[PDB]
Amino acid sequence: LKKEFELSKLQQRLGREVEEKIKQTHRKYLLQEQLKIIKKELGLEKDDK
Amino acid sequence: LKKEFELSKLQQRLGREVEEKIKQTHRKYLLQEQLKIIKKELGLEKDDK
Amino acid sequence: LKKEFELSKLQQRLGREVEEKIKQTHRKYLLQEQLKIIKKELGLEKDDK
Amino acid sequence: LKKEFELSKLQQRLGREVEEKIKQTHRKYLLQEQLKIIKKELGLEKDDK
Amino acid sequence: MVEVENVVHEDFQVTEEVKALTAEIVKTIRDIIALNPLYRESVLQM
Amino acid sequence: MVEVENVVHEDFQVTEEVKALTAEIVKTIRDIIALNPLYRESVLQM
């Protein structure tokens, strides 16, 4: 049972790590996106066609 | 009820007046608060375009 | 309660001693178990990119 | 009522079907991703820049 | 069949320091369920 | 083929500390189905 248990707990740590890395990715993307919107917001043509 | 309404009315009105005199503080102060917020959470030297 | 807790305690301590002597088994054995998981989990691959 | 009911039930089945296709996509990705991590652990397959 | 409710429940008049052993009984029960867990601890909380 | 019901089942006469290991077996089984849930828990409650 423990032989199975060691792998399971390892997998649990690995799963939280991969998922938290995805969260650290996207949460920081929300922060950078907020940064952009504040850098853009001022009245401007908002470069485009 | 009249006395309570006059007390609550004078308190709400005096406080509304103090609040109006506080709204006179310029919106730039708010923009400065958000500015300090931008600096409180950014990091990350420039390695982009 | 003293005698029963001492019985459970002596069993838990003797078993903890057994557990330490099994922990004397080297971590190479654990990593070998993981290597067996690499070699005994599956044979074929499905829906490979 | 039945004429509407048939189309509605059809739409419900159709929606769950597309959703299940997304699940069949990602669940196999979870299995294959686990496969990759185990294949990368067997020696040194990927390394950083 | 003869029976009698001999539910003795004698108690010393001073009932202040007599409940101190019970406190040790519940602390020992918490240690019994913590090092050798057998039953749930919710019944002790009820 | 020759056979005999040699269902060996030696057990200590003293059955006090022999069911104590069982407690660890069920705690490991509860942690395996709690931390890595595979099957239903109704069979365990029965």
Residue B4 C-alpha from the chain's centroid: 29
CA quadruple C37, C41, C43, C45: dihedral sign: negative
CB contact under 8 A, C45 and D38: no
Report the alpha-carbon distance of residue E26 to residue E45 in Å, rounded. 11
Q: How many CB atoms lie within 10 A of CB F45?
A: 6
| CB-based contact A5:F28 (threshold 8 Å) | yes
Q: What are phi and psi of F13, to 5 degrees?
A: -60, -45
Using CB atoms, pick whichever of D28, D32, D42 lies closest to residue C38.
D42
Name the residue with tokens 């509860």: F30
Tokens found for residue A36: 């952009």
CA distances from C12 to A1, B1, C9, D9 (A): 18, 73, 5, 60
Residue F18 C-alpha from the chain's centroid: 12
CA distances from E32 to A16, B24, E35, E41, F20 (A): 34, 67, 6, 11, 13
Determine the 3-state secondary structure of E37 from DSSP.
Answer: coil
- Interface with chain A: mutation pick from B27, B28, B38, highest number of A CBs within 10 Å: B38
| CB-based contact F37:A9 (threshold 8 Å) | no
Alpha-carbon torsion, ordered D20, D23, D25, D31, to 10 deg: -140
| CB-based contact F29:A5 (threshold 8 Å) | no
CA distances from E6 to E2, E3, E10, E18, E35 (A): 12, 9, 11, 22, 38
Q: What is the DSSP string of A25-39?
A: HHHHHHHHHHHHHHH
| CB-based contact B15:A8 (threshold 8 Å) | no
Report the alpha-carbon distance of residue A36 to residue F9 in Å, rounded. 74
Q: How many contacts does C have with D, using Cβ atoms within 8 A?
A: 16
Report the alpha-carbon distance of residue F41 to residue F46 in Å, rounded. 9
| CB-based contact D46:D40 (threshold 8 Å) | yes
Which C positions 17-36 lie with beta carbon below 8 A of chain E? none
CB contact under 8 A, A6 and C33: yes
Nearest to D42 by CA among C31, E36, E28: C31
| CB-based contact E44:E30 (threshold 8 Å) | yes
Which residues in chain D have Cβ-Cβ distances shorter than 8 Å to C49?
A: 32
Q: What are phi and psi of E6, to 5 degrees?
A: -85, 55
By the 10 Å C-beta count (0-12 exposed, 13-18 middle, 19+ buried), B11 is classed as exposed
Which residues in chain D have Cβ-Cβ distances shorter than 8 Å to C46?
A: 28, 31
Give, as one character, the DSSP assignment of residue E18. Answer: T
Nearest to A22 by CA among D43, D29, C39, F2: D29
Nearest to C1 by CA among E43, E38, F14: E38
Distance from the Cα of F24 to chain E's closest Cα (Å) equals 9
Q: Which residues contact D35 (CB under 8 A, 6 or more apart)?
A: C42, C45
Nearest to D28 by CA among C47, C42, C38, A16: C47
Q: Please tell me if residue C14 touches chain F, with a CB cutoff of 8 Å.
A: no
Distance from the Cα of B38 to chain A's closest Cα (Å) equals 8
Q: Please tell me if residue F21 touches chain E, with a CB cutoff of 8 Å.
A: no
Experimental technique used? cryo-EM
